[PDB]
Amino acid sequence: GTVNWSVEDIVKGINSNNLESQLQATQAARKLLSREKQPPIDNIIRAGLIPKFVSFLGKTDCSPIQFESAWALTNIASGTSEQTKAVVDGGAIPAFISLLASPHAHISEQAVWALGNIAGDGSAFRDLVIKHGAIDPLLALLAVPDLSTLACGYLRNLTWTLSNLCRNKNPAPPLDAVEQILPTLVRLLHHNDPEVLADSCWAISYLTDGPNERIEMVVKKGVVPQLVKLLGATELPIVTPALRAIGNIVTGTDEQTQKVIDAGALAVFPSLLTNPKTNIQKEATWTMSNITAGRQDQIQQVVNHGLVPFLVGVLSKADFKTQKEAAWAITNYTSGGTVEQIVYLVHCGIIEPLMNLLSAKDTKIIQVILDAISNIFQAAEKLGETEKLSIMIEECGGLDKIEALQRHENESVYKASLNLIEKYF
């Protein structure tokens, strides 16, 4: 009936003065725009149909055409930034916000979806959706005693749209909007649906990626223990955003990092640092690097949890990016650690993998490793053991690497390698 229409037939039907013909044509457009391959979005836009769909959004007495037009506009706004912009330029934002209060759950769901696409375009349309007043009705849709009474798809769509309202960072979302959304986000973060949990964790990760004041807004809500719990989850779609959020949080002040530590996060890193998923290993090692850049008692907590051998393992064998994160962790550890902590690090076997990594073609990691070596040598000096560390570095073949670095492109590598060779060798 409304399958495989031509855009010309759709235009004829919508340009008729017959609401039912308009509805059939709008459904035909929806079915065209919801097909598997190559939906004719640009042809629909060229025909000037967006303003008609937007007007149909306000037909309270014809809920079917409201739903059909909402779906069509949702699929148009899901495309390029120019197609989303075409939807916005037709006045769709306030119409969808008004539809958020529809008595029909499927229509309000479609409005939530469309606003999610518009906000997901980027920070400008996100902030414009916020300025039109979307947050209040969106959150009102979730103001129920128990989230389990809502349909799973409805709740997942609401969570995804809210996460898009927390997304992007040039500029970051308005502070007032973040504060208005956060409690509902915590609620959702305690839900039992894995997709809701994943998207809520992703929203928290968005909100924690930035200045330490944003991290503080998030941490003050008491979400860190739940984030650690989810970090322990069996589903990787949940562990990934939880780990991102935890890493973001430990990029902040020593007190925020301490909040992460007090919640028991380190006990999970034996698994994360050996996780078969490369991205998990990389981001866990990055998190560890930011924790080793903390205070000496926090480095000591890293030591007590037995995580130094796991850093040695990652440095010894892993994807090169994870090995770079591990080099960063080692340099931070040696820069901020006590003499006893650096001695412990050496006793765990860091020297050999550190040296084997000096044969890489990435200048940054070479600089990081040479700085770590300098710090360890300073500790040795304080202990009067410089010659023994020298012998160790020679035995594993690191002396030859440092000598080769003496003739390197970068000036810092040149200088540091020559300083090491002339002061300790």
């Binding site: 699929n75 495309g79 991205n279």
Partner: peptide, 18 residues
């Protein structure tokens, strides 16, 4: 010395309803 950042993939920014 703290270094800020820069299915298991992040949620899609936009979603078509098939």
């Amino acid at each position: 010395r703290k270094r800020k950042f820069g299915t298991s993939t992040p949620p899609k920014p936009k979603k078509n309803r098939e």
